[PDB]
Design a binder for this molecule. Structure first.
Ligand code: MG
Ligand code: MG
Ligand code: MG
Ligand code: MG
Ligand code: MG
Ligand code: MG
Ligand code: MG
Ligand code: MG
Ligand code: MG
Ligand code: MG
Ligand code: MG
Ligand code: MG
Ligand code: MG
Ligand code: MG
Ligand code: MG
Ligand code: MG
Ligand code: MG
Ligand code: MG
Ligand code: MG
Ligand code: MG
Ligand code: MG
Ligand code: MG
Ligand code: MG
Ligand code: MG
Ligand code: MG
Ligand code: MG
Ligand code: MG
Ligand code: MG
Ligand code: MG
Ligand code: MG
Ligand code: MG
Ligand code: MG
Ligand code: MG
Ligand code: MG
Ligand code: MG
Ligand code: MG
Ligand code: MG
Ligand code: MG
Ligand code: MG
Ligand code: MG
Ligand code: MG
Ligand code: MG
Ligand code: MG
Ligand code: MG
Ligand code: MG
Ligand code: MG
Ligand code: MG
Ligand code: MG
Ligand code: MG
Ligand code: MG
Ligand code: MG
Ligand code: MG
Ligand code: MG
Lengths: 200, 131, 180, 122
RNA sequence: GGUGAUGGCCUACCAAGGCGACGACGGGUAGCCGGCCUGAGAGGGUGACCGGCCACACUGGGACUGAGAUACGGCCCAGACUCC
RNA sequence: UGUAAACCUCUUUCAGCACAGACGAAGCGCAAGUGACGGUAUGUGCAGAAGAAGGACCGGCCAACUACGUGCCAGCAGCCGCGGUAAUACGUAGGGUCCGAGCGUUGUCCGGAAUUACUGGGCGUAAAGAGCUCGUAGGUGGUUUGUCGCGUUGUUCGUGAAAACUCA
RNA sequence: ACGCAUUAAGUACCCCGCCUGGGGAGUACGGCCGCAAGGCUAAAACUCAAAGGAAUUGACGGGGGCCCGCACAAGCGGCGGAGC
């Protein structure tokens, strides 16, 4: 199941922008609640939980399968933090969101659930696809005729496509080439506290 | 009862390092001589020697200290002792200070350092963890 | 840029003829992020003064711990004060794992991969004392070779030799990036 | 302890101080009430609580604590019992779930409804 | 003498010994193991399923059949249970 | 409370209704045919945001606070402890937190427990050296001269079932 | 921690006794010894969420040294008797 309640509540309580263009946040950064002014006592667990929640709702990932993320990252021989960030950025949802074919990660998930795309010529209608390397992601004719996808493809003029990701032309073919690196990704927050909380 | 000459020698070395001595006198033995071989070639004892005494041959140990008075050997603990004896396989050779230390291993060739044993693939009994 | 982390604000009281007099004492650690550790514990009559004295004490009492890459060199048996603490360098991304005071001091020092496990009498002050003692008990391979009259290749394993080489290259790249 | 002593004697681990003797290792036992009465907690906390003496399928006579605010329990009422300590009552070590068998959850509850077994509003 | 096969498997006679404090025999517990849970680790717990073995077939015994019987729905006897 | 809500556009996965529709069978027959699962899995169409969210916690540990109602009662509760009229700890409300088609309670087992201390405990008083000796068995050995190598590691092929874990 | 500080609690080595929160209780049952008083070996249940160690300041002490006040002693005059 996904989140059906308000989405701006998340940013308001979290104290940082999630989508990026929040007028309501900039109008009132204080987290909701009749006591959004009470001073918050320092707590290492508190901050670890804060970081965990922010990352989880930022990526739309469910709690259990993101624990699965963390354990899988431990399993891989590389460093746990960058392994986790790699495996969570590999999400087809994040791929479409950051390739300019989805305005928001939630909309990418909605479209994938609708099943309007072809991956390597095989129909797929699952959000959490594992986008390997060298792969190719397509979009099919009914998706093309769909209006909002057209708008997104002409609106992909935001923060430019990251290094390993790129779009080749009007058909919007997305292909990944090399290994994303933490420094170039510059995904926000620090994996230190996430790994600490899950190693608790 | 001098029921562990190796332990007594190592205790004398560390105690002399603590008391800031220069020479330590001990009864001489073949095991003492070869262990001195090991430590001197590793560079922990400035130099040993074997002399003659009233009854039996002995040995004197010459240590070094770091240029700023620094102690040469920080800690000394025996591992394989009468009663509790410890051995190791070719793969499970002990690691001391992540390689920064030297563990004295008895292998077929004799007593060689941890790196020598690891490169040769041979193993045996680890004598003392010297740091 | 320096780091200050509140670890333990405590309430104390003293008794004289009229009754009980309450008091405050606090402990705080300061570090630069490259391996400089500073602790300060002080008493005061209220939280702001206590923190001020703690920061002053931390600035006064400093220390420098040579780190390798982004992790400690070898495992440290931190025995002192009343607690027992052991440390183990870690691989990257794993983080610096320990208890409260241990993490306070370590994140102040700036490390990012280490393992620690408090082994009895975890009182924060004694724990921090033991962490500092262990941290100062570390050894630098270059100085070890210098003392033993032995050279770097023969003293230090090839693994950490390559690790130090890569760390040096990364530091040079960072310096070039900053200067440019 | 020297190594020879260790070999001679063997190392004995702690024997577990098992709590909740009644269920004999079970997560649940069913019982029938024998009496309903009241008792006064220890000195630090004074009150008038409601405790029930129940016969168990395991034939053990142990009191149980009555949750909530109102109850419909009269002598000879089949009940369900769970495990839990109680500090105010020294001779009490069991609760009595509400909303099962003949014990229903106290009416007028909407917060923490699940713990006491109450239905929704409509 | 007996067993598909050596052997107190069974019989007769000789000798008094054998097992015992590096725990006999006694008592309570319980199918063993590859494994499952935990733990960095050693280690602790534990034996769900699958699987490798063991033992059981209302309770106690015995034997026939054959290359193959603890013979579950094969046999006989005794007790209990139910029924004609 | 809240971009929440109604609102204007959209796709409508999955359920609903229909069409096509597999393989699971170089398998068997000297026969022409052999599929329960299932007329399902799976594709293609039809109208519709239309059929779809709850549970625990919010005194410190412990990320989540305020007012309303009774005040040593009625009660909470994991330990500390919370009510003797103005409770962030009871109940009600809102608001917030965690989680989520599952959410809590309970109970068994490991952990932190280095709280049975081999790794890796202590013995002055906190719990512990017996009251002190000789000394059997066991446990242990002050030196070098000598072989057999049974303690030992040394390597070569030679066993370690499948299944489970770790790598691709 | 008080403290030990070569006649160690230091740094080691070899062996042996012993302990794992407080009551219960070194007691109940049992075995052994004793002529006995009792001794030796050594339990569980239930209850408590603390008991204990060295040390900091108070407070107090029919504990010590140095100090001061109609505090005591030496004086007058008094109230507690009666009415008011
Ligand atoms: Mg963990
Ligand atoms: Mg010799
Ligand atoms: Mg040892
Ligand atoms: Mg020590
Ligand atoms: Mg000291
Ligand atoms: Mg402790
Ligand atoms: Mg603790
Ligand atoms: Mg014969
Ligand atoms: Mg025989
Ligand atoms: Mg015969
Ligand atoms: Mg059996
Ligand atoms: Mg196993
Ligand atoms: Mg472990
Ligand atoms: Mg273990
Ligand atoms: Mg088993
Ligand atoms: Mg099988
Ligand atoms: Mg099986
Ligand atoms: Mg077999
Ligand atoms: Mg049978
Ligand atoms: Mg049979
Ligand atoms: Mg049968
Ligand atoms: Mg039958
Ligand atoms: Mg077919
Ligand atoms: Mg065919
Ligand atoms: Mg489909
Ligand atoms: Mg369809
Ligand atoms: Mg609650
Ligand atoms: Mg909180
Ligand atoms: Mg809180
Ligand atoms: Mg009130
Ligand atoms: Mg409440
Ligand atoms: Mg809420
Ligand atoms: Mg546990
Ligand atoms: Mg221990
Ligand atoms: Mg004592
Ligand atoms: Mg004693
Ligand atoms: Mg005695
Ligand atoms: Mg050989
Ligand atoms: Mg071989
Ligand atoms: Mg083999
Ligand atoms: Mg295989
Ligand atoms: Mg595993
Ligand atoms: Mg002494
Ligand atoms: Mg001692
Ligand atoms: Mg006890
Ligand atoms: Mg006793
Ligand atoms: Mg007796
Ligand atoms: Mg006795
Ligand atoms: Mg004391
Ligand atoms: Mg004093
Ligand atoms: Mg007078
Ligand atoms: Mg008068
Ligand atoms: Mg008068």
């Amino acid at each position: 199941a996904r989140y059906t309640g308000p989405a701006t509540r998340k940013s308001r309580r979290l104290g940082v922008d999630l989508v990026g263009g929040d007028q309501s946040f900039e109008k009132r950064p204080y987290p909701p609640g009749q006591h959004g002014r009470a001073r918050i006592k320092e707590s290492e667990y508190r901050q670890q939980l804060q970081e965990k929640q922010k990352a989880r709702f930022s990526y739309g990932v469910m709690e259990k399968q993101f624990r699965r993320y963390y354990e899988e990252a431990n399993r891989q021989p590389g460093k746990t933090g960058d392994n986790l960030l790699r495996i969570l950025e590999s999400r087809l949802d994040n791929v479409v969101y950051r390739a300019g074919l989805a305005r928001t990660r939630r909309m990418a998930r909605q479209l994938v659930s609708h099943g309007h795309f072809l991956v390597n010529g095989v129909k797929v209608d699952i959000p959490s696809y594992r986008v390997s390397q060298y792969d190719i992601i397509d979009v099919k004719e009914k998706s093309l005729n769909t209006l909002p996808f057209q708008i997104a493809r002409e609106t992909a003029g935001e923060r430019p496509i990251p290094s390993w990701l790129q779009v080749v032309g009007e058909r919007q073919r997305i292909l990944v080439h090399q290994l994303p690196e933490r420094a170039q990704i510059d995904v926000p927050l620090t994996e230190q506290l996430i790994v600490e909380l899950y190693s608790k | 009862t001098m029921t562990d000459p190796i332990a007594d020698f190592l205790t004398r070395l560390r105690n002399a390092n603590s008391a800031y001595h220069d020479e330590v006198t001990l009864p001489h033995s073949k095991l003492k001589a070869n262990i001195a071989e090991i430590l001197k070639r590793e560079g922990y004892i400035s130099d040993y020697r074997t002399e003659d005494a009233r009854v039996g041959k002995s040995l004197v140990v010459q240590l070094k200290y770091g240029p700023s008075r620094e102690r040469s050997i920080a800690g000394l603990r025996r591992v394989s002792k009468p009663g509790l004896r410890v051995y190791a396989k070719s793969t499970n050779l002990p690691r001391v200070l992540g390689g920064l230390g030297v563990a004295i291993i008895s292998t077929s060739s004799g007593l060689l350092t941890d790196r020598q044993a690891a490169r040769q693939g041979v193993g045996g009994e680890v004598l003392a963890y010297v740091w | 840029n320096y780091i200050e982390r509140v670890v333990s604000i405590n309430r104390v009281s003293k008794v004289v003829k009229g009754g009980r007099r309450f008091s405050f004492t606090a402990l705080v650690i300061v570090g630069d992020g490259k391996g400089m550790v500073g602790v300060g514990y002080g008493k005061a009559k209220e939280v702001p003064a206590a923190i001020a004295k703690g920061v002053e004490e931390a600035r006064k009492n400093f220390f420098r711990v040579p780190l390798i890459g982004s992790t400690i060199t070898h495992p440290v048996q931190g025995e002192a004060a009343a607690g027992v603490v052991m440390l183990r360098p870690a691989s990257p991304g794993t983080g610096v794992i320990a208890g409260g005071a241990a993490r306070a001091v370590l994140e102040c020092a700036g490390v990012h991969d280490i393992l620690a496990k408090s082994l009895g009498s975890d009182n924060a002050i004694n724990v921090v004392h033991a962490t500092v003692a262990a941290l100062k008990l570390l050894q630098r391979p270059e100085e070890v070779a210098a003392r033993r009259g032995l050279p770097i290749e023969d003293v230090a394993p090839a693994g950490m030799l390559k690790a130090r080489r890569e760390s040096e290259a990364l530091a040079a790249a960072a310096a070039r990036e900053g200067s440019a | 302890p020297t190594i020879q002593q260790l070999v001679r004697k063997g190392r004995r681990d702690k024997i577990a101080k098992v709590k909740t003797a009644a269920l004999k290792g079970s997560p649940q036992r069913r019982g029938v009430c024998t009496r309903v009465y009241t008792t006064t907690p220890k000195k630090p906390n004074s009150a008038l609580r409601k405790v029930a003496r129940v016969k168990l399928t395991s034939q053990v006579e142990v009191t149980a604590y009555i949750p909530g605010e109102g109850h419909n329990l009269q002598e000879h009422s089949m009940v369900l019992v769970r495990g839990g300590r109680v500090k105010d009552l020294p001779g009490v070590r069991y609760k009595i779930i509400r909303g099962s068998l003949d014990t229903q959850g106290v009416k007028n509850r909407k917060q923490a409804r699940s713990r006491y077994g109450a239905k929704k509003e409509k």
